[PDB]
Amino acid sequence: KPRADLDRAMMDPARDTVVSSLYKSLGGALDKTAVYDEEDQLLILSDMETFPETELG
Amino acid sequence: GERPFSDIITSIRYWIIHSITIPALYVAGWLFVSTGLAYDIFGTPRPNEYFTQDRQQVPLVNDRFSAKQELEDLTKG
Amino acid sequence: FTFRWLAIHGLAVPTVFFLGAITSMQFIQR
Amino acid sequence: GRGWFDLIDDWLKRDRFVFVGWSGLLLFPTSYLSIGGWFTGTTFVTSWYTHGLASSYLEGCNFFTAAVSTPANSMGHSLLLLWGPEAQGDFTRWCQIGGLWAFCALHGSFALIGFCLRQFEIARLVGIRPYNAIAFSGPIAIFVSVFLMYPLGQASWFFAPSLGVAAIFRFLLFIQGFHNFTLNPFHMMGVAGILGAALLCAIHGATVQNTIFEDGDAANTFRAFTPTQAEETYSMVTANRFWSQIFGVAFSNKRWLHFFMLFVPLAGLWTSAIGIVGLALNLRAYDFVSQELRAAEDPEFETFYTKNILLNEGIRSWMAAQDQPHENFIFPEEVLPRGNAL
Amino acid sequence: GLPWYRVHTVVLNDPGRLIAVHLMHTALVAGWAGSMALYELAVFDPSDPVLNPMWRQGMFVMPFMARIGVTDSWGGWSVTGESVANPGFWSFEGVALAHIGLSGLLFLAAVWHWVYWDLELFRDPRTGNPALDLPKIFGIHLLLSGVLCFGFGAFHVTGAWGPGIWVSDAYGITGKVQPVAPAWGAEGFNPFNPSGVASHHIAAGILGFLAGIFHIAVRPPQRLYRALRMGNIETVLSSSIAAVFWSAFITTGTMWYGSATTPIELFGPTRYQWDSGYFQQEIERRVENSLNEGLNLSEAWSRIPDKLAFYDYIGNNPAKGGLFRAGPMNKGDGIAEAWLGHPIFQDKEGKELTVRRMPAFFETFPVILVDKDGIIRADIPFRRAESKYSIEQVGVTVSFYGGKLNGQVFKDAPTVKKYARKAQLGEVLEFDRTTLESDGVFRSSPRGWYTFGHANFALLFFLGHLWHGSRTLFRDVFSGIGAEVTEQVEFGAFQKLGDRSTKK
Amino acid sequence: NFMLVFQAEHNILMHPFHQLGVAGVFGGSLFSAMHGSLVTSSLIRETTENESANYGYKFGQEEETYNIVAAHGYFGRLIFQYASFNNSRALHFFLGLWPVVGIWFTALGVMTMAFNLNGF
Amino acid sequence: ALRTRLGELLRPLNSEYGKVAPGWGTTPIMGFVMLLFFLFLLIILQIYNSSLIIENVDVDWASLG
Amino acid sequence: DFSAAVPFLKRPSNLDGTLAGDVGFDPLGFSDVFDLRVLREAELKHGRFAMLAVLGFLVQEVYTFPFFPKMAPVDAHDYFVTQGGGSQIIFWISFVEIFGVVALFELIQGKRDAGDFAFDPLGLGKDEATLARYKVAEIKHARLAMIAIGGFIHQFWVTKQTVLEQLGNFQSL
Amino acid sequence: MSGPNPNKQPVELNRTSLFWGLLLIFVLAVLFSSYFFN
Ligand SMILES: CC1=C(C#C/C(C)=C/C=C/C(C)=C/C=C/C=C(C)/C=C/C=C(C)/C=C/C2=C(C)CCCC2(C)C)C(C)(C)C[C@H](O)C1
Ligand SMILES: CC1=CCCC(C)(C)[C@H]1/C=C/C(C)=C/C=C/C(C)=C/C=C/C=C(C)/C=C/C=C(C)/C=C/C1=C(C)CCCC1(C)C
Ligand SMILES: CC1=CCCC(C)(C)[C@H]1/C=C/C(C)=C/C=C/C(C)=C/C=C/C=C(C)/C=C/C=C(C)/C=C/C1=C(C)CCCC1(C)C
Ligand SMILES: [Fe+2]
């Protein structure tokens, strides 16, 4: 299993190798994924608008 | 944004380059047909090439992977 | 020089070529 | 600033005269090549070595008789690539074996995919629901079934429709003769869908044009409408009353009316596609078994269905000799069915 | 209220009842498998595997049971024709009863998951709403499917721990379940090589296991999460339907064109074996090889097996049936009893004549006899036409070699016409008609019915995939559009279409 | 049987009036599906997620139930900006005009082939 | 929401709803794998179509022997 | 700070140089991703197996037990597949490495040095300088024998003759 | 827990839909009865 305390902030990109770059490309050291989407992605909009009634009508 | 039609049709270059290019394309197609180049490029038979002396029937291709050789045999002469 | 220019010229040069070819074919003695 | 993908996405989705989008990369070259290949086939390419036919303006055909003919039967279901083992890079032999039909068919399949993706993309960018792509799935079903799934179930690409006019008429009569497709109930549902869609189009146009409100003083009423107006331009109540007391039933919901106009042709096309897919394997509604048994047991028993069966036999027997020249069908005059022969 | 076509959307955000309805569907499918197997066992006749095999009797799930090992029955018979003294539990009846019991257990599980829907597992620890971590669920399921595929291909197909799969010869004479060694070269992509099945399943199981590890380990990108709407389960439905109809097209093709996974001793021959004269060429080659050994025609044609001559017959063609000619193949031309032998047609001068075989397109074909050159020397008139080359005029005589009529020569015109009509269909056979009251119109094999059903199902699932992709990518405008569309639809209002920040 | 005998004796498929009728029915289906999809695509949001969208329109309401400008913009960007009908009245006149004229022409073609003026 | 033994066992396997990798993540390598899969499908399709003939790969019923 | 062994490559960030044989050689960079302690455990165990295997090849070529039949070492593998001695050997290797799994788990937890089973029965290494020198010699011999055992096996596979036999008559093909 | 599921929704079918469904099923029966019988 890949090591702990690995992140793409302390690891110098200038010292990258084949395996290290392949690990970065395959989503390794993803400790920055604490962000969530924060979008409902099932929210159907319900902002109905009422048309004003005219005198003709 | 877009280019209006009046600017297109009132451009002096737009007319001279068309007058020197488009009739050239028209004559190019006319000579592509009239010199017999279309028949040779696309394999379309000439009116005197549908039937040969030895083949008086429809030239059917009967094998898949030797189709090029069969067509060369049928279209020779 | 735009994308509309290319879209027109894709359907224009071979169109004129084919129209000339067909007009030439109209005079082939059948 | 922005990434390269974001810049490409911004340029493709630019609001210009001809929208390109991401779907344009698949649509425009494929549709362009399909149309160009069809014109090239109907203009120069012969059918002498596949069907023994002339199908180009170079051979003397008009608009009706010129076609991009299907490949030869010996080719099977080959993709017929220009670099493939049949043509081996020779453009002339590729045109002579019918590879241009495969060119047009594959590029048209991917062009239909591209156009449906274009509908999805423009509906997503504009912000409306994508019911137009669902509607266009109908013609996609027609093209897929007829031009791909039918020949892929048959012996080769040879029995697919050829891209012409008289060629399509040949396909109609060939399918009727060898399949009795009029008797197929899925084709009946397709005919019902098409004719009911024409009926709906005509009746909705007439009803709207004849129940408009008097929104202007001019006798010609086309100018009495603005696209940005809030009120309806025609009376739904008057139309509903008219069709309730004329026909018995009438639409009262405009949205249901337009979804029905969307649904009828789509259902017709999909059911007819099911029918053609059934025909692809010769699984047909060719005959009613009890009618044939009663006609065999009773020579005096005759219906219009039996006459249709005899007409199909006539089509097959008088058409197969020149329609399938690779089989070398030699039918003598005595084996050919004739009405006076019995 | 909900319309009739949206009644199942109540379990869209209810994971427990989604699992419950999936369990109910699985129970229904397993119960159908069991009941179909029981019915087919009730209507199967294992007496004659040569001339009445399972595809002549309309067996549909029996070929799939016999494809990967299950060939014996508790009645003491096998589909290969042998006798089994000790059948074991995994017979056809054992599989059917196992499917029935599995259906019952899945039904009870569905009941439990419908009642106990509010499990704490289905609720997000961060928000508390009922949610499913679909990417990690996909990782788990991909890992499970990789393990299952690798195990199937490494133990079941190879025979390391399992029966193997059905392997036949090139002409469907001697087929049985054998262990299959995998082929790791390019010959594993030969679709008629059964070693490709084992090698494919091993390699794909390994790759799926690795990909499942990756998908459990790694979260999706934010761009792909927003683009594909990975928080919505309808994108999973859309992509699953897409993959399912892709697979349905693949199986339709491999069934119609034939492969090592669709042997002809279980699903019947293909139409392209009749179009190319596959069995006819094989039979002619064998007869020629026997004639080159000094044998006469009778001994050469008597050496041809009845199975091989039965394959060379247009009634076994899947492309000769009808859409509403329901039932087994024996409901059509009948139940095959015996091979009558190869007819050879000779005129009054002794020249041999061959009846031109009927193509699969033709419901009716004219009976014409050609010589070795290809010239019409005799034929049958249409129904009542005046004739020039009729059978009575040319004096065609037919002599049968091999089969039941071996050595017999028929010279009377009605019999010669009857046998020419039969030879138009291929090899002449004897059919039984009073057992099932066969009407006399050809019917399709299980191969053709499978192809029809799955081609139509794939075509319809293409529409389903389009519908669910549309409902996924357009979830916000499901009930209609608002007033924010009027500004976007103005031509040239924005530089980029649909982007409010690119206003001119 | 009528269709088959008519094709045998008059070659109706090659008759340009029957071709106009086929264009009429195919175009009528195309335009019916097109108009239905454009109206259903641009329906104004007036319902909740748990009911049919048809109930957003009330029988006899004054306002329009769908955004004509939105459908016009979508169809203008689909093909080109004046391939659409800005006017709904002109659009519906075209809808009622295309298949009616097509069926008129094919009926007149059958009427002319009654007196043996056959197709091409 | 009732808590069960199996539910508590499987809870960490369903606990990261909405958790995403920032930016483009692994999209380029995903596209590379998709390209390889497209090439593989093309190869096997052209083999099954007999548009791609390989040594010792006879796409035929007769290859069964 | 470039690598001492490779002058054009940077020194790997996890190879500080405290380990025995840590010269900075890691072009592919397996130490950047996987744990260095587990990698050194695997390296040392591979090397110990290879050293025992090379010594075994030499001894088996020069002397076979009289109650065993006389043959080459490589094709004896199938003979002891059939006979059952190889099953015993792998059985006892598996028995030792069942506790090897626990040792590896303790290595993961960081309570054990890499390759350190504390196996010094003769008391050869007790001084720290001698211990470091022995560690360096052990890792160098492990690498050399890891190469050498594959060399022996492949040379027997291509030449159908053993090691000292090939050194007897050097046949080149 | 075992009780009120929040996703419970009523199901409607107005008379127009009932008549359309009846017409569809009866017309389909009329169409396919001739083919099922033969
Ligand atoms: C399968 C099988 C068996 C087996 C077996 C076995 C055990 C097979 C084992 C095979 C092995 C261990 C092969 C090892 C090869 C090592 C190489 C090529 C290292 C090269 C290093 C180099 C070039 C260094 C290069 C260098 C580098 C990088 C650093 C410095 C510079 C330089 C020196 C140039 C049996 C015998 C049991 C029988 C069984 O029935 C079948
Ligand atoms: C196929 C192939 C070969 C190798 C190259 C390549 C791989 C690119 C590939 C594609 C080549 C391509 C794209 C060729 C392009 C061909 C094109 C665009 C040909 C277009 C020709 C246009 C023509 C006739 C115009 C016809 C219009 C006519 C009469 C007018 C009809 C009229 C109308 C519309 C109303 C009634 C009155 C009237 C006047 C009769
Ligand atoms: C006509 C038609 C419409 C259009 C499509 C198509 C043409 C294909 C055709 C297909 C129709 C369809 C979908 C038919 C579906 C048939 C099905 C699902 C049949 C399945 C029946 C299930 C059965 C028996 C289950 C039996 C299980 C039982 C007792 C279990 C009992 C038990 C339980 C409950 C508790 C434990 C103990 C025990 C004994 C196990
Ligand atoms: Fe309207």
From TrEMBL, chain C:
Residues 1-20 form the Photosystem II cytochrome b559 N-terminal domain. GO terms for cellular component: chloroplast thylakoid membrane; photosystem II reaction center. Heme binds at H9. The chain crosses the membrane at residues 8-28. Heme b 2 binds at R4, H9. With its partner (PsbE) binds heme. PSII binds additional chlorophylls, carotenoids and specific lipids. Keywords: Chloroplast, Electron transport, Heme, Iron, Membrane, Metal-binding, Photosynthesis, Photosystem II, Plastid, Thylakoid, Transmembrane, Transmembrane helix, Transport. GO terms for biological process: photosynthetic electron transport chain. Its cofactor is heme b. It is found in: Cellular thylakoid membrane; Membrane; Plastid, Chloroplast thylakoid membrane. The keyword Acyltransferase does not apply. Coiled coil: none annotated. It is a single-pass membrane protein. GO terms for molecular function: electron transfer activity; heme binding; iron ion binding. Heme b 1 binds at R4, W5, H9. This b-type cytochrome is tightly associated with the reaction center of photosystem II (PSII). PSII is a light-driven water:plastoquinone oxidoreductase that uses light energy to abstract electrons from H(2)O, generating O(2) and a proton gradient subsequently used for ATP formation. It consists of a core antenna complex that captures photons, and an electron transfer chain that converts photonic excitation into a charge separation. Belongs to the PsbE/PsbF family. This is Cytochrome b559 subunit beta. The lineage of its organism: Eukaryota, Cryptophyceae, Pyrenomonadales, Chroomonadaceae, Chroomonas. The gene is psbF. The chain holds residues 13 to 42 of 42 of the full protein.
UniProtKB/TrEMBL annotation, chain E:
NCBIfam families: PS_II_CP47. Chlorophyll a 6 binds at R67, H99. PSII is composed of 1 copy each of membrane proteins PsbA, PsbB, PsbC, PsbD, PsbE, PsbF, PsbH, PsbI, PsbJ, PsbK, PsbL, PsbM, PsbT, PsbX, PsbY, PsbZ, Psb30/Ycf12, at least 3 peripheral proteins of the oxygen-evolving complex and a large number of cofactors. It forms dimeric complexes. Belongs to the PsbB/PsbC family. PsbB subfamily. One of its GO terms (biological process) is photosynthetic electron transport in photosystem II. The gene is psbB. Pfam families: PSII. This is Photosystem II CP47 reaction center protein. Keywords: Chlorophyll, Chloroplast, Chromophore, Membrane, Photosynthesis, Photosystem II, Plastid, Thylakoid, Transmembrane, Transmembrane helix. Chlorophyll a 3 binds at H22, H141.
From TrEMBL, chain F:
This is Photosystem II protein D1. Fe cation binds at H35, H92. It comes from the Eukaryota. Signal peptide: none annotated. A quinone binds at H35, S84, F85. Chlorophyll a 2 binds at H18, T106. The gene is psbA. Herbicides such as atrazine, BNT, diuron or ioxynil bind in the Q(B) binding site and block subsequent electron transfer. 2 of the reaction center chlorophylls (ChlD1 and ChlD2) are entirely coordinated by water. The record marks H10 as: Stabilizes free radical intermediate. The chain holds residues 181 to 300 of 360 of the full protein. [CaMn4O5] cluster binds at E9.
TrEMBL record, chain I:
It comes from the Eukaryota. PSII is composed of 1 copy each of membrane proteins PsbA, PsbB, PsbC, PsbD, PsbE, PsbF, PsbH, PsbI, PsbJ, PsbK, PsbL, PsbM, PsbT, PsbX, PsbY, PsbZ, Psb30/Ycf12, at least 3 peripheral proteins of the oxygen-evolving complex and a large number of cofactors. It forms dimeric complexes. Keywords: Chloroplast, Membrane, Photosynthesis, Photosystem II, Plastid, Reaction center, Transmembrane, Transmembrane helix. One of the components of the core complex of photosystem II (PSII). PSII is a light-driven water:plastoquinone oxidoreductase that uses light energy to abstract electrons from H(2)O, generating O(2) and a proton gradient subsequently used for ATP formation. It consists of a core antenna complex that captures photons, and an electron transfer chain that converts photonic excitation into a charge separation. This subunit is found at the monomer-monomer interface and is required for correct PSII assembly and/or dimerization. Pfam families: PsbL (PF02419). This is Photosystem II reaction center protein L. The gene is psbL. Belongs to the PsbL family. It comes from Chroomonas placoidea. SUPFAM superfamilies: Photosystem II reaction center protein L, PsbL. The chain crosses the membrane at residues 18-37. The keyword Transmembrane applies. It is found in: Cellular thylakoid membrane; Membrane. It is a single-pass membrane protein. HAMAP family: PSII_PsbL (MF_01317). GO terms for biological process: photosynthesis. One of its GO terms (cellular component) is photosystem II reaction center. The keyword DNA repair does not apply.
